[PDB]
Structures are given as structure tokens and as C-alpha cells.
Amino acid sequence: ATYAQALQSVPETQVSQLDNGLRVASEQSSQPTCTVGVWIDAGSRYESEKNNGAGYFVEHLAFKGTKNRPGNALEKEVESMGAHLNAYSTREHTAYYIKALSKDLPKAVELLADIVQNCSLEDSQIEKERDVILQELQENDTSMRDVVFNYLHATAFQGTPLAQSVEGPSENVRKLSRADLTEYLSRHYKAPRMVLAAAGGLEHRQLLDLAQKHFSGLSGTYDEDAVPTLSPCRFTGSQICHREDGLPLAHVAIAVEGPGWAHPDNVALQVANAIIGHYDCTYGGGAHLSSPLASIAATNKLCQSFQTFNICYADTGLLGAHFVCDHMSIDDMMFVLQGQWMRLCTSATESEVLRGKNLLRNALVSHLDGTTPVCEDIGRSLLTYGRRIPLAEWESRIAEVDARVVREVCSKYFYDQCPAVAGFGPIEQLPDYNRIRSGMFWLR
Amino acid sequence: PPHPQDLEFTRLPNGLVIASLENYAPASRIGLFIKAGSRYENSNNLGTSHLLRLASSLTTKGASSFKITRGIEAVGGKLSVTSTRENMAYTVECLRDDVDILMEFLLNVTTAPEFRRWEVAALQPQLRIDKAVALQNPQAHVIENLHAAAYRNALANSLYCPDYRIGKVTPVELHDYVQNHFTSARMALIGLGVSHPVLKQVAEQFLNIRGGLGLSGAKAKYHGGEIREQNGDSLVHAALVAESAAIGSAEANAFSVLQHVLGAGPHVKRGSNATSSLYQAVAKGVHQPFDVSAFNASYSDSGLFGFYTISQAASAGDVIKAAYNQVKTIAQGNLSNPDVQAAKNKLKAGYLMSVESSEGFLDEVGSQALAAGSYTPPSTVLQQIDAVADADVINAAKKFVSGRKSMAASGNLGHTPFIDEL
């Protein structure tokens, strides 16, 4: 009963469509509970300078009751029946989803269609969520991770929509009226730009007929030159350095232009990011850690936490790393990190690739363990890749990545490329850009 | 879908439980659950659990500290350690083709640790870290105190080493602690994504060590009382509980249902927790940011039940009383069958969800396997939830309002009441 074979026994996610557009999606297991939800191509990238921060506003209001269920009914009906209701916005995506008992699936699917379609947007409620969000923005202001990552975006994609935060500038929050939100809603929540995903105990076609029942009644098509197109966002080699000394630790994020959801490199880049890995002071490994950056960092306390990332978007991304550290360890942490990138680009040993591959393999299988995970995979896979992808395919793609590939691929995206750098905190040590830029090439 | 399987089960001659669902996932997940949490630390060798937790991957008999860390990472595995106030849970993960390597490194860590003076001495200051990282959350303070106020001998013991003991834990004390508590009569071997023959074969051969509990716990003599750490945070955290009943009795279930009647947690993102009895009761005299929820702890030896208050600075007096009154007027008997029937769904679903992912499942299988004898499939749990009458609930609320009180508070406690002012 091998790993290769175990990939065969995986339920092939079943997907249908409607005349009105809504793709329907589901993976069946014999799970007594399930997860089902709506996935949408909307957010702060589709937003624009004047209406920025609205997708967050809608997400806020969506659970404050519909027309067919006024006040806090929508809430109580889901609360009392036991199930769980959640939602989130990003730069390129929005999802509203419910965890429920298998038997409740029919009732569940109904409520979602109501949240999406028949949202109240009470004028008294708008001013209630206006004070909420203003305070949710002060919270983030003291979460250096979130701040640095938004800065990285700002200066990586300066002058384009991606540069925009999902939450939106504190002005807009204070001056967005119903008119703006309703418009956003009707202009962006269209049935072909949406997916209905679910996984657990359910048979595909039970969902599909519930979709015909409650989602046929949704806006079924769109008008001609109103449903927007996405402009490519320019990546700009740049730096943004918020020097604040009174903070205990410095956060930095550095990244080069990623490939985009589309591109097949995203496998060899995940393999590569797995090799350099990730770390924090509470890891057991210490010096014996396989990632030389992690072991160096651990023995010398260069940092108290660092993680590589591959943030992906439509036709671009951010491929880099982030670290939290002491006001005097920044240069060294940076030096070791860039070192590793250049080491990968120019010499990437064979076995260390085989370590990455397996870490990644482990990652995706043990990531898709639950319903909430797989429902969310299905929900986005369609919104980005166009289809869902079998673990058996991901495996094939991983199994083709070897030393020569990892290098060609890393060399392609790192070697001699202008990176984008966000630094927040006591960063007087954080190297000069002209220095950092020279860290991206070799034969010194 | 594929074809559901019987969670197999065995109990070797020396009391050692073995269990194994073979659900043909690509991943394999193996736990070795042991009765060696904080409760079994005596009044001298404190923190020895905590250090022992961190001490996974110090050199063992068959594998060096290096070989352990690098070997697992070479296949991208994972060797986790999960302690409760009662149980330690050394749990591995990996692909189903590597199971024997990860099994191997697991047995060395448990049966054959060396605890070298210079490694154990080098590890010590991690206690300082791991503790401080965790006491970021002001809850940990409050809960740690609460058990130390409530109970004495065994469960009063913290999960995190006390201050004075950081550094002072000897490698002898680990040898001793492992020798005394890592025994066949205190251990269950749980397997997910592995066949039963091999889990047995390995258990017989390499886990058959002295099966004689080398120490036993006490009976958890409940004391009761109050601990108050004045420290000026913006908010104030305070928990108030009373002697509940242990897990495995049908009286536990009545407290579980009593919980979801009062307060569970958010079920709908960003809502006002409309259904939550406690939140709603304390929703109405006090107009501010605040929080309250129902605390329900339940171990083999004993249990706690009551509420947790995250109030304002000066709203502590109001919130803690107002919430108490609301539980009182349940003990007095204001409980419609609808309210029990809602809570029974919350719990029925809440349980069923909490074993959905392999991660929780294994922790419940190993939980049952140790706590009492063999696995109790979900249907029986869902049935036993239904079994609880509407009397037992009000009797649980009666046992609280009447029962002996434990309170643990930390924040600015100027306007915080004491058990006698409550």
C-alpha cells in the first residue's frame, strides 16, 4: 500500500456549471461533517483609489442579516443549528463558508446564497461597522508582521492596484457610503466570477440541485463593458524603511518578482523555498537543523524568527523572505539569507533538493487534511488555475524538479534581480539598497 | 469515496493499549500516549515534565541528537510532543513509505534517552524562552493560577516549569521521571495510516519495558480559593470555577451541555454572539468592550467548571457578578427544552468536527485508550449527549452555585470582587 498508490485512492473532485455561470464544486469523503462555501474573484486588486477598503466593509456587513432574515437572524439560525460560519477578503479573492453536519448541507447552501445575494446593508449598521473597522486598523498598526507585509506590497507594486491594502486607507473607511458598496457588490459578485465549493459527506449532484434552487436566482450573467479586466501590475525594485527605534525588534521583508499563479516554476520555487526553509527560537532542532540559514541563525541568534514565502497573484507575485531580529543582527541575517539564494542559484546540491521535495510533498498532503482545507483548495483552484489539481499531478511535477532545475529556476528569478525591501523598526543597521542589490549577484 | 475501516485494537499482556486505523491516506500519523503530565510531578522535581517536553531529540541510545534532527528532516517528517496536565503525547508525521524510520526515532526518544549532562545543561535556558513565549497570552497566567488555587497535590502543578527551578533540573531527574512514568501500564500506542501487524510487532519487541507504574498520582484533593496577580494591563482577566465531576461519568456530559447553554465561543465571524446565554446576560447593564465564556475542564481524577471574564478595568465588578447571576437563575431552573436542544446540537456537532482532521482524531483515540479502555465510536458519544436529561443540566448548575469556589484574577484588580464579595 504505497505512497504512489495512495494518490490513486484520492476522490477526484467533481465539478459542474450553471447556464447562469456559477461553477459548482465538491469532493466526497464519508465524513459525517462537511464544509461548503462561496469563492469569488474580488478584493483590493479589483478595487480602486476612491473605493478602496470596500470589500472589507461588505465582508463586515454580510453577516449582519439579509432581507429574508433581518437583524441577527442569519447569525442565530447558523449558531443554533450548531454549524460554523466564516469569511475572508484578500487582494485577489473573497470567500464566505460554512462548516456543517452532512445532513445540514441543504439548509447550509441556502443561507450562503442569501448572504451573497440578498444582503441588507442597513444604514444604521454601516455606521456601526465604520467605528469597528477604524479600530481594527489601529490593531494592525501594532502588528509589525502585517505592517511590513503591506509596506512590501506598497513599494513592490507602487503605482498599481496591488500596492493597495485589503483594509483600505483610514479616510475611505470614514467616507464610504452605501452607494459605493452596493455598486461594488452588483458589479463584482457575478455568477461566472464565482465558485460553490464543498467537501465531506455529500454526493456532487445533491449540491448542484441546491445550486439550481438558490443560485439560479442570482445575477446570472453580466453586461458588456462594465465587468472589468485586470491591468498587469508593475513590480518596482525599491525600498521602504520605517525607522522606529522605540520598538523592541526589527521586521524586514525582502522579495523579488514572483511568477504568478499560472506559471509551472511555482513548483521548483516551492521546492527551493523549502530548502532554505523557516525558523523561530522555539524550534527544537537548533544547530542540527538541515537549513544552513536556520542552523547559523540558531547557533548565533542572528534572528528570533524567519520564513521564506511565495505570495502568488494573477500575473506576478512576491518571492522572498521575512525576518524578525535584534537591532544589531540585521546585516548578518541578510548576508546569510542572500548567501543562501546565491548558493542555490549557482550550486544547488542534489540531495538537498530531495530534502525540499519531500518537505513540500509532506506539506501539501498534510495541508489537505480536513474538509475546511479541501473546500478552500477547491474554492480557489478554480478561481486561479481554472481547474482543481490531483495530488498525483502535483507529485509528478515535484518528481521532475532536480538540481539543474532548481538552479535554472532560482537563477532565473533571483540572480542579478532588483529586490523590493520593506523594513520596520530599529533598522539603522539594515543595509543600504546599493549594498543589498550587490547581494543578488556573485563572484565577490 | 473509498471504504471506511474498523479502528482495530489490542491490549498486550502488560496492559499496553495498541490501536490502528488504516485509512490509506498518503500520510501516516503515529502517537505514543503516556500518562506523564504535570499531575505526576512531585513537590520537588517540578518542571521536569516541561524540560522533558523540550528534550525530544537530545542524543538517545541508538541515535545522536544530530541524526534525529537531520534524519527526520531528510524525509520531511515531524516529531511533536504534546503535554496535558495529565498526558504526554509524542506524535510523529510523515509519508506512508517512511513509517519505520519515524517509528524507530520515536522509540529511541521514549525508551532509550541518555540525557547527557552537557546537553541537558545546554537545553535549560530554553525553559525561560518557551515559558515566556507562552505567557504572552494573559490566559496562561490565569489558568496556571486557577489550578494552583483550586487543587493541591497533583493538578495544582503548572505545565511550565516554575521560575526558581529553571536551570536546576538534573539529568538524573529525567532518567528517574522517564523510568518511573514511561511504563506499559501508562502507555497507549496509536496509529493512523498504518496496519495493525507492524504496530503490534514493534510494540512487543521494542516497547516492552518495565510495566510497573514507578510512581502513581495522588487523588486530586480539591482545596478551593483565590490568587490575584495585580499587574496593570489595559483589560482584566478573571476566572471563577467550582468543583465539577470527572470525565467518563454521565455527570460530565451534563456539564458539557451546561457549557454550550451558557457560552461556547464565536460560531459566526464578527457576530454579537446572540445565542450565548452568558454574553447576552452580561450584554445589558454594561456598555463596553468585554468578554465572557464558559470554562469546562474535565480530567480522569476530577474536573472544573465555571466562567472566564475578560472585562474592562472598572467593569470587572459588574461583569463577574452579572454573569454569575445568569448562571444562578439557571440553577433556579429557567431552561426551556429548546435551549437544551440547541446546546445538544452545538456539542454534537462541536465534537464531530473536532475529530474531522487526522490531528484531533489521534488525540481522542489516544485520549480514550489511556483514560479508560478502548475506543468509543462517535455514534455512542452523540447518543450519550442525547441521554443527558434536562434535570442533570440544572443539577450541574446547582452543583456549581452551591459548590466550593476557585477564582484566579490578573490585570488591574482595583474594582475586582473576591469570592466573599461575589
Binding site: 523561530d280 527544537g284 532542532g285 | 525530544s56 516529531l79 503535554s83 496535558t84 489550578h147 483589560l235 468585554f290
Partner: peptide, 21 residues
């Protein structure tokens, strides 16, 4: 750290941060 949306088992490992359930 933040505030404003409020409505034991210890755990440590070799690859995960420590969590307090």
C-alpha cells in the same frame, strides 16, 4: 498586541511553535 474582538493542554515540538490549548 491588539484588542477588540473577544466574544489546559500545553504543546511543544521539534518543527512547530508551542501552542497552549
Amino acid at each position: 498586541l491588539c484588542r477588540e474582538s473577544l466574544r489546559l493542554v500545553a504543546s511543544v515540538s521539534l518543527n512547530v511553535p508551542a501552542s497552549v490549548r
